[PDB]
Design an enzyme around this catalytic site. Structure first.
Site, PDB file in Angstrom:
ATOM      1  N   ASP B 281       0.528  -0.724  -0.253  1.00  0.00           N
ATOM      2  CA  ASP B 281       0.242  -0.249  -0.242  1.00  0.00           C
ATOM      3  C   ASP B 281       0.962   1.385   0.103  1.00  0.00           C
ATOM      4  O   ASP B 281       0.549   2.050  -0.660  1.00  0.00           O
ATOM      5  CB  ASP B 281      -0.757   0.167   1.498  1.00  0.00           C
ATOM      6  CG  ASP B 281      -1.774   0.588   1.732  1.00  0.00           C
ATOM      7  OD1 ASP B 281      -2.556   1.036  -0.845  1.00  0.00           O
ATOM      8  OD2 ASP B 281      -2.743   0.500   2.340  1.00  0.00           O
ATOM      9  N   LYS B 347      -7.111  11.936  -5.369  1.00  0.00           N
ATOM     10  CA  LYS B 347      -7.357  13.425  -6.116  1.00  0.00           C
ATOM     11  C   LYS B 347      -8.897  12.435  -6.716  1.00  0.00           C
ATOM     12  O   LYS B 347      -8.505  12.528  -7.847  1.00  0.00           O
ATOM     13  CB  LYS B 347      -6.050  13.437  -7.062  1.00  0.00           C
ATOM     14  CG  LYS B 347      -6.587  14.901  -7.443  1.00  0.00           C
ATOM     15  CD  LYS B 347      -5.751  14.670  -9.122  1.00  0.00           C
ATOM     16  CE  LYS B 347      -6.293  16.189  -9.762  1.00  0.00           C
ATOM     17  NZ  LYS B 347      -7.860  15.354 -10.762  1.00  0.00           N
ATOM     18  N   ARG B 589      30.180   8.487 -25.812  1.00  0.00           N
ATOM     19  CA  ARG B 589      31.461   8.859 -24.374  1.00  0.00           C
ATOM     20  C   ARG B 589      31.959  10.291 -24.566  1.00  0.00           C
ATOM     21  O   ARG B 589      32.867  10.466 -23.656  1.00  0.00           O
ATOM     22  CB  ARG B 589      32.377   8.204 -23.821  1.00  0.00           C
ATOM     23  CG  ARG B 589      31.677   6.263 -23.248  1.00  0.00           C
ATOM     24  CD  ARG B 589      32.412   6.086 -22.600  1.00  0.00           C
ATOM     25  NE  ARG B 589      31.642   5.414 -21.199  1.00  0.00           N
ATOM     26  CZ  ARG B 589      31.086   4.530 -20.875  1.00  0.00           C
ATOM     27  NH1 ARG B 589      31.326   3.554 -21.708  1.00  0.00           N
ATOM     28  NH2 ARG B 589      31.277   3.749 -19.636  1.00  0.00           N
ATOM     29  N   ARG B 684      29.401 -26.791  -4.872  1.00  0.00           N
ATOM     30  CA  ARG B 684      29.082 -26.176  -5.916  1.00  0.00           C
ATOM     31  C   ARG B 684      29.736 -24.466  -5.539  1.00  0.00           C
ATOM     32  O   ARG B 684      28.729 -24.296  -5.058  1.00  0.00           O
ATOM     33  CB  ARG B 684      28.693 -26.265  -7.767  1.00  0.00           C
ATOM     34  CG  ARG B 684      29.338 -25.645  -8.405  1.00  0.00           C
ATOM     35  CD  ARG B 684      28.826 -25.178  -9.490  1.00  0.00           C
ATOM     36  NE  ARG B 684      28.952 -26.108 -11.180  1.00  0.00           N
ATOM     37  CZ  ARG B 684      29.200 -27.580 -11.008  1.00  0.00           C
ATOM     38  NH1 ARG B 684      28.185 -28.182 -10.531  1.00  0.00           N
ATOM     39  NH2 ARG B 684      29.776 -28.305 -12.460  1.00  0.00           N
ATOM     40  N   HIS B 783      28.762  -7.326 -20.958  1.00  0.00           N
ATOM     41  CA  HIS B 783      28.558  -6.056 -20.704  1.00  0.00           C
ATOM     42  C   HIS B 783      26.477  -5.617 -20.754  1.00  0.00           C
ATOM     43  O   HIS B 783      26.531  -4.948 -21.782  1.00  0.00           O
ATOM     44  CB  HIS B 783      29.193  -4.667 -21.251  1.00  0.00           C
ATOM     45  CG  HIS B 783      30.885  -5.146 -20.821  1.00  0.00           C
ATOM     46  ND1 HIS B 783      30.934  -3.412 -20.295  1.00  0.00           N
ATOM     47  CD2 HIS B 783      31.181  -5.800 -20.744  1.00  0.00           C
ATOM     48  CE1 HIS B 783      32.207  -4.180 -19.348  1.00  0.00           C
ATOM     49  NE2 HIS B 783      32.420  -5.042 -19.770  1.00  0.00           N
TER      50      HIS B 783
HETATM   51  N1  LIG Z   1      -6.848  11.733 -12.061  1.00  0.00           N
HETATM   52  C1  LIG Z   1      -6.130  12.001 -13.481  1.00  0.00           C
HETATM   53  N2  LIG Z   1      -5.248  11.087 -14.443  1.00  0.00           N
HETATM   54  C2  LIG Z   1      -4.823  11.580 -15.178  1.00  0.00           C
HETATM   55  N3  LIG Z   1      -4.130  13.527 -15.023  1.00  0.00           N
HETATM   56  C3  LIG Z   1      -5.173  14.290 -14.404  1.00  0.00           C
HETATM   57  C4  LIG Z   1      -5.584  13.750 -13.197  1.00  0.00           C
HETATM   58  N4  LIG Z   1      -7.144  14.849 -12.946  1.00  0.00           N
HETATM   59  C5  LIG Z   1      -6.619  15.393 -13.590  1.00  0.00           C
HETATM   60  N5  LIG Z   1      -5.155  15.687 -14.664  1.00  0.00           N
HETATM   61  C6  LIG Z   1      -4.631  16.659 -15.512  1.00  0.00           C
HETATM   62  O1  LIG Z   1      -4.976  17.458 -15.063  1.00  0.00           O
HETATM   63  C7  LIG Z   1      -5.545  18.616 -16.191  1.00  0.00           C
HETATM   64  C8  LIG Z   1      -6.786  19.544 -15.651  1.00  0.00           C
HETATM   65  O2  LIG Z   1      -7.594  18.561 -14.969  1.00  0.00           O
HETATM   66  P1  LIG Z   1      -9.069  19.445 -14.952  1.00  0.00           P
HETATM   67  O3  LIG Z   1      -8.911  20.349 -15.859  1.00  0.00           O
HETATM   68  O4  LIG Z   1      -9.873  18.274 -14.925  1.00  0.00           O
HETATM   69  O5  LIG Z   1      -8.285  20.082 -13.583  1.00  0.00           O
HETATM   70  P2  LIG Z   1      -7.862  19.892 -11.469  1.00  0.00           P
HETATM   71  O6  LIG Z   1      -7.986  21.112 -10.974  1.00  0.00           O
HETATM   72  O7  LIG Z   1      -6.761  18.706 -11.081  1.00  0.00           O
HETATM   73  O8  LIG Z   1      -9.301  19.087 -11.443  1.00  0.00           O
HETATM   74  P3  LIG Z   1     -10.194  18.901 -10.908  1.00  0.00           P
HETATM   75  O9  LIG Z   1     -10.633  20.792 -10.216  1.00  0.00           O
HETATM   76  O10 LIG Z   1     -12.222  18.744 -10.580  1.00  0.00           O
HETATM   77  O11 LIG Z   1     -10.177  18.174  -9.091  1.00  0.00           O
HETATM   78  C9  LIG Z   1      -5.680  17.278 -16.852  1.00  0.00           C
HETATM   79  O12 LIG Z   1      -6.708  17.828 -17.640  1.00  0.00           O
HETATM   80  C10 LIG Z   1      -5.094  16.251 -16.845  1.00  0.00           C
HETATM   81  O13 LIG Z   1      -4.071  16.022 -18.357  1.00  0.00           O
END
Ligand SMILES: Nc1ncnc2c1ncn2[C@@H]1O[C@H](COP(=O)(O)OP(=O)(O)OP(=O)(O)O)[C@@H](O)[C@H]1O
Ligand SMILES: Nc1ncnc2c1ncn2[C@@H]1O[C@H](COP(=O)(O)OP(=O)(O)OP(=O)(O)O)[C@@H](O)[C@H]1O
EC number: 2.7.1.11
Lengths: 49, 884, 884
Positions: B281, B347, B589, B684, B783
């Site tokens: 985790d 997130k 290199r 061995r 290598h």
């Molecule tokens: N769960 C996620 N996975 C991958 N990329 C993400 C994710 N969340 C946000 N992003 C990246 O951030 C960019 C902006 O996301 P967004 O416009 O939804 O704003 P945010 O502040 O992260 O969202 P919110 O305010 O809804 O939490 C996305 O287009 C993406 O490229």
């Protein structure tokens, strides 16, 4: 198992052969018979066997 | 001649004389001659050194004071002295508050000032190598708790051996808390040194884990307490998860259970308890990495890699990831495999529905060209309103809202199975060692520790404070403060979260204003290393995120100088680069001075680069210094220069971690396992030739991770006496195998350890000396150790470092443009600070190239002072090696 | 930008314009544009090069003329051109009468002047390796005459093979003139290529010699003439002594013996005759060395060396030397073995009786400490009044006038027996080859030649003129003009006579006035070489002879700088040094800059050395250059610096002969003979590893001297195609041995010829390819090839060169003291001439270090253009080798 181990081994060889090294002489231990080497050659795309 | 010799130096003082008398006696080793006529300074017997001091007003206090301050500009007649080992006197003067002048600071002539200024010192008459330098007892109990975590066996192996070595009985508590509550010989078995043989390779827990319902109540907690006092166990070591350790913490506070129902209560009065996190985790708060986390991360990435290894429109793929509380696995897998969208608990979508968020991000990616959409779903995948988001939920959105044929891949138990990855084996082992020491060093006034890793360094943290902090994070999630929860997680987690969203976001307007946008270039210098391509991928995508123009210098300095290899970086062209091995840009290199330094400088100004990122080994290290030193000639080079060390060797000073060393370590560890397994099948030994050059880092770590009996390193070499001793060790080892596990024997020999005693020579000597009792065979892989597909750790670390590099260039560019636009550049301290090496030290720090090149490196043919000395000691301890 | 490019250069001429038009067209490759508007210079199509010339009075004739002369001092605004291979243009300008400025003369930017001065040319924008450079049939008769001379068989072998190769029948005239006069199949036998197998090793003459009484008269001379016309012999090759060749010369003038007693008289109308001197005496005047002279000299010195190899007072030893007409053997043995007194016909006692002369010289030597008196008596030992002096005569003087127990050693036939020494084998062989060519190239208008050696170079000299000159010498001796006779002998003889008497004479007042007496020092730099000790012995004794103070710098530059190893040279201490191997002084490979150059300079001034003699190899070569270049810093080094090359390798430019190469050649030749003899005993080849480093000189010469089938050299390398071809040669060679002499087979491989195809590898390939028809074995003697006791040639040459070195220092010291006593030393041409390399070229010459280091050497790691190309061609011819 051996042929699988060898092909994989050589895939890593050709990748490390891409200012280190160009040509690799991979030694195959298949006794006094050319079977292992021949098979390995076909599956690895070896120039000479 | 007529000027036959040099009798003495005569100095005139104003009226006061004493200040100088104290200086020449304490600093130079002179002495006042017996019975002074008025109120001579000679050095020693059988010599001819003398300085005469007179108090006659022939030298003024005003003139002398002005002359002393006048010299503080770094010309006047002086006197030089013949003195051996000037280095010692220079330190004694500088620390004594006296300024000094010298040749290479290594050093040739030393020059300081008194009330009598310009007192020179030469280390010889004329140019030549200089004049030679003159003249405690307590029985331990181990247990594992919670779900299977790779690295639990390496940890237990370590505790059993460390405790045995420290002279104390080790008991393995089978079935965790269940075994502790039930007690008896049935669950509490005394473990021997040979009983934990080859457990490094073994997956899961050989001891076993069990969820004890009774221990959740005071009913069981008391029964467990009795069993420890009955077994005579004076100390407990728990290796498990969050609750697994919280329950141990509660047991610690509840330990005062004196219960009258006194000999035993007097002796077994205090609970010596130590914790180690055994979880996939990575949810525990006071540690950067938990045991099993990187192996689990590796299983996930292994699946994603296989998914990416194919063709096709209208295709989406879901990777269902195990990890109930944290989003670390989801975030790191997402980063390592450049996933489109990740569903992690820290997130969740906030300003819009998760479906709208997902579809927007996925859509933008497909629209720009990316055909293989990968979505990672955490076990703890959740929405704002804490509603759990399932895989099918995610699948239907992809199948119905978008026209994608979605195929779900679920890891399940795969994420807990298999051998521990090199990082888990190395760290679990060291944690086991530390857990024993902690348990022994413990005193009633010391709070119960938990073993933690903090930026590649083993530390002790209070278990209560770690248990409290993890709950605080869970509270933040449950109280719907995700922004807070993210900040509460370790600093690496917050940085990775920032790194991921920025690299995931070219397809959104730049984050910087037009004025603050720059032209940053990247090169690869040295032999290829896992993460070179990831550092390039992350830097380019981060540049696009900020609004910078990322440029790639193809095939090092030779490609630039001879061929104008400056090339732009297109997002679609770099698709899957983070997962590719070697160098796509091309590495060599060739040094800037072995290529045209003037031509490098010309192209730097032609393309107007605002900064440079070097990804590579020792040649890239020298390159930095060569580019830094050429700044006086070329204004074009007066820009921030940053090096991200990338070598399988780890020979570059400035970092404790070089990119590609984990990829390499893991491939060699997998090779050594097969070789030891083969030795185990036949009396061995195998002499395994190791790479890394003049750096003994890889053989040190491979010895620890594989359980090699010996590792021959370039820093120590191979003596005949040590070789004979080690051969006799083998002789005895095989004579004692009668009865124990046949795990096999390895000797790891770095090619550079001996030019004479080679892998093949060593092995023939073993056979000669073995006298038919056993044989020796070599294992020389070559290598090839570089490895293809870089380790998730390498992919992740490279991303982090590439971003820190861009961010440094952002910070320092304004200061540099002062030196750039100006001639009369006298090569100050403000400018030398911009040519830096990004590195891990205990702390992630940028170190100016000047201090590492002049002082921290064998600049010469060696290309390399080591840190891994303790790792070495422990691996010799664990294998029973006797040094000389 | 705004200054986007460069269209054209505009030049203004006074009123006349044409001189420059001719310059830029012939020198730069420009062309006048078609149909001129007034009365444009473009380079070529698909370009952008242009120079505009206008006749408007904007540039004055007086100003331009003054500016051109002003530049003749080695600053002004100029124009540079991008041009590939600047070296070609620089030569074209310099030879065209135009001065040029360049970087290392290798070269980077070139700069010349026209009526429009400072026309620069660069070979690229900024520093980097430059822009790539754009786009006849007659049957021969051989005979030997006179006493047995080592080298007669090698000569005949050469004539038989050379003549066969050139496509003509070779007949061997058995019993010389007797065989020629008697004629028939009995004495005139047709010889085949395989019939002269292994004759290199064979002593004396396999053909045979006989004194023909009949040929002394016209009676026999006619009979001999008939026999040649009957045998169909169109050409005669005589290999013999003085009279042996005078009789051939008389036979040449008497050839018009048409005698009617016409087909044959028409064809066999002219006598094609060629001579080669086959004598131990070295009496023939137009050659420097006769065939057998150095082998005979070797036998003598071998005896003297054994005599010196013992204890004892009242002991004298007489070495009775064979050699009736000349005193060359006596003089050279005397020189090589530092004999007390020599009795030779050219230098009989004049101002006093020979007994008085001998006793004085012998007496002085014993008085100063020399206990082993050696007296050499020539066969032609004579007094003023031409009375022959016997050994017994000499013995009685030593036994009765002095109290010495005298033991006579007489060589007798020993002096004609044995195998020819390396010099005799190499030279007799090449002379044989030349004799054939001379005989074939001959035409009736060409005077009959005699093959001669003139300072290590094979030449043709008219036999009449050589016969006449030898008679002139004999006349001078018989007419009692010994001083004249000495001058009439070759320039080497006169120099050796001078060298011997001067080195023989510390025990007589100095030959120079007090003012003209100097302090000369000697060092040995590099690995030891035979003659190092002889060069020291001869230089010290010659210094004492002049009144100089000879100093020895012990253990090279490291000994001087770190230990003050300046040591005086005592005559008694250096007793027997001329005959000792290695370096008594001590030699090493340490360079003046690897030792303290300042310290070398300090001791040079402390001891006030007026000159320096370096005896050593390539490190001593670099040493000269390093000492020469340091002259600007140190006035102490502004003295004549002379290098006498001493290496077994012969890698030093400036000489064609390095000291110790003959000692080495001979030891390896003796080794190869034993190996070939062993091959001859068993269908076997030997691959013999040769020393000499990156120089292929020793293997070239060893191939010729030993009859090796192949010699693999570092200059050519070893190709697989050549190796396969050469192996197939061996395959065929053994298939053709059925019937012929079994002489054995050798392949000589210089260690540096191939790093991969080594002696051991090559030999295993031969066995593989041989398919059991023959085998291959290696012979690796090692770095032992140096050899002990130096060859008489080395001892003699070292004496000659050491004296020429001292004499150069004498000449140049006065000029040097101008630069020595003065600061503001701008490093002129007068001073650079004093740092020189003594050498053999075709002529014995001193070559300034500057021209040999900059232009004639691979200064770098190679340490070495060869001269031995012809020797190589001939040795491949003689062994049937086919190259690619
Ligand atoms: N769960 C996620 N996975 C991958 N990329 C993400 C994710 N969340 C946000 N992003 C990246 O951030 C960019 C902006 O996301 P967004 O416009 O939804 O704003 P945010 O502040 O992260 O969202 P919110 O305010 O809804 O939490 C996305 O287009 C993406 O490229
Ligand atoms: N035959 C010789 N053998 C060795 N050394 C000789 C011989 N003749 C002369 N010398 C050397 O020359 C030195 C000077 O010689 P000497 O005193 O006889 O004068 P010289 O010119 O050689 O004699 P002369 O006028 O009689 O021919 C000797 O002391 C010795 O070094």
């Amino acid at each position: 198992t051996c042929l699988n181990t060898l092909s994989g081994y050589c895939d890593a060889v050709k990748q490390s052969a891409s200012s280190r090294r160009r040509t690799f002489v991979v030694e195959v231990q298949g006794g006094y018979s050319g079977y292992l080497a021949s098979y390995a050659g076909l599956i690895t795309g070896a120039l000479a066997v | 001649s007529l000027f036959n010799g040099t009798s003495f130096i005569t100095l005139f003082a104003p009226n006061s004389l004493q200040a100088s008398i104290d200086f020449y006696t304490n600093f130079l080793g002179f002495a006042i001659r017996k019975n002074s006529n008025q109120k001579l300074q000679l050095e020693e017997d059988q010599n001819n050194v003398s300085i005469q001091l007179i108090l006659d007003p022939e030298h003024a206090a005003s003139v002398s004071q002005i002359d002393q301050n006048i010299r503080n500009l770094t010309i006047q007649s002086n006197i030089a002295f013949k003195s051996s080992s000037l280095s010692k006197l220079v330190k004694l003067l500088k620390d004594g508050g006296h300024p000094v002048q010298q040749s290479p600071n290594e050093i040739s002539p030393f020059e300081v000032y008194t009330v009598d200024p310009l007192g020179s010192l030469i280390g010889f008459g004329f140019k030549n190598p200089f004049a030679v330098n003159e003249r405690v007892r307590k029985t331990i109990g181990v247990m594992t708790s919670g779900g299977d975590s790779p690295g639990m066996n390496p940890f237990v192996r370590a505790v059993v051996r460390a405790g045995i070595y420290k002279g104390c009985k080790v008991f393995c508590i089978h079935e965790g808390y269940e075994g502790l509550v039930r007690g008896g010989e049935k669950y509490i078995k005394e473990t021997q040194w040979h009983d934990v043989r080859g457990w490094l390779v073994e997956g899961g827990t050989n001891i076993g884990t069990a969820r004890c319902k009774e221990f959740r109540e005071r009913s069981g907690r008391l029964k467990a307490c009795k069993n420890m006092i009955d077994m005579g166990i004076d100390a407990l070591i728990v290796c498990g998860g969050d609750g697994s350790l919280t329950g141990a913490d509660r047991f610690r506070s509840e330990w005062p259970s004196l219960i009258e129902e006194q000999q035993q209560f007097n002796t077994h009065q205090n609970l010596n308890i130590c914790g180690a996190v055994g979880s996939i985790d990575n949810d525990m708060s006071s540690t950067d990495a938990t045991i099993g986390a990187f192996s689990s991360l590796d299983r996930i990435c292994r699946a994603i890699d296989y998914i990416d290894a194919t063709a096709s429109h209208s295709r989406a793929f879901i990777v269902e990831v195990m990890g109930r509380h944290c989003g670390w696995l989801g975030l790191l897998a997402g980063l390592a495999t450049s996933a489109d969208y990740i569903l992690i608990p820290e997130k969740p979508a906030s300003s819009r529905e998760w479906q709208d968020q997902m579809c927007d991000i996925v859509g933008k990616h497909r629209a720009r060209g990316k055909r293989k959409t990968i979505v990672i779903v955490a076990e703890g995948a959740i929405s704002n309103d804490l509603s759990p988001i399932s895989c099918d939920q995610v699948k239907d959105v992809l199948v119905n809202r978008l026209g994608l044929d979605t195929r779900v891949t679920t890891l399940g138990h795969v994420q807990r199975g298999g051998t521990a990855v090199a990082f888990d084996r190395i760290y679990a082992t060291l944690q086991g060692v530390e857990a024993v020491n902690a348990v022994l060093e413990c005193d009633a006034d010391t709070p119960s520790p938990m073993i933690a890793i903090k930026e590649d360094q083993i530390t002790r943290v209070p278990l209560v404070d770690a248990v409290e902090l993890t709950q605080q994070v869970a509270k933040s999630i449950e109280s719907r403060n995700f922004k807070k929860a993210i900040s509460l997680r370790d600093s690496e987690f917050v940085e990775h979260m920032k790194n991921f969203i920025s690299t995931n976001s070219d397809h959104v307007p730049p984050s910087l204003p037009l004025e603050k946008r720059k032209k940053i270039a990247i090169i690869n210098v040295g032999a290829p290393a896992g993460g070179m391509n990831s550092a390039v991928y992350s830097m380019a995508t981060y540049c696009m995120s900020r609004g910078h123009v990322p440029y790639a210098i193809h095939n090092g300095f030779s490609g630039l100088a001879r061929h104008e290899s400056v090339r732009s970086i297109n997002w679609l062209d770099i698709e899957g680069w983070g997962s590719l091995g070697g160098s796509e840009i091309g590495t060599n290199r060739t040094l800037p001075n072995d290529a045209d330094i003037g031509m490098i400088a010309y192209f730097f100004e032609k393309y107007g680069f605002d900064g440079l990122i070097l990804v590579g080994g020792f040649e890239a290290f020298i390159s930095l210094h060569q580019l830094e030193r050429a700044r006086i000639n070329y204004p074009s080079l007066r820009i921030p220069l940053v090096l991200i060390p990338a070598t399988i060797s780890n020979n570059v000073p400035g970092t404790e971690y070089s990119l590609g060393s984990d990829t390499c370590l893991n491939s060699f560890m997998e090779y050594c396992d097969v070789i030891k397994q083969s030795a185990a099948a036949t009396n061995r030994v195998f002499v395994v030739e190791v790479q890394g050059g003049n750096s003994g880092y890889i053989a040190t770590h491979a010895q620890l991770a594989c359980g090699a009996q010996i590792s021959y390193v370039p820093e120590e070499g191979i003596s005949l006496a040590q070789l004979e001793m080690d051969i006799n060790s083998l002789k005895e080892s095989f004579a004692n195998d009668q009865g124990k596990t046949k795990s096999g024997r390895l000797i790891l020999k770095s090619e550079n350890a001996s030019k004479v005693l080679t892998t093949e020579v060593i092995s023939t000597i073993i056979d000669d000396e073995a006298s038919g009792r056993f044989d020796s065979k070599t294992a020389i892989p070559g290598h090839v150790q570089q490895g293809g597909i870089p380790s998730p750790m390498d992919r992740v670390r490279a991303s982090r470092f590439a971003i820190r590099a861009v961010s440094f260039i952002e910070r320092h560019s304004d200061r540099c443009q002062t030196f750039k636009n100006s001639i009369s550049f006298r090569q100050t301290d403000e400018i030398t600070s911009t040519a830096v090496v990004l590195g891990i030290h205990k702390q992630l720090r940028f170190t100016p190239i000047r201090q590492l090149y002049d002082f921290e490196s064998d600049v010469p043919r060696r290309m390399r002072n080591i840190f891994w000395s303790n790792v070495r000691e422990i691996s010799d301890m664990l294998s029973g090696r006797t040094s000389l």
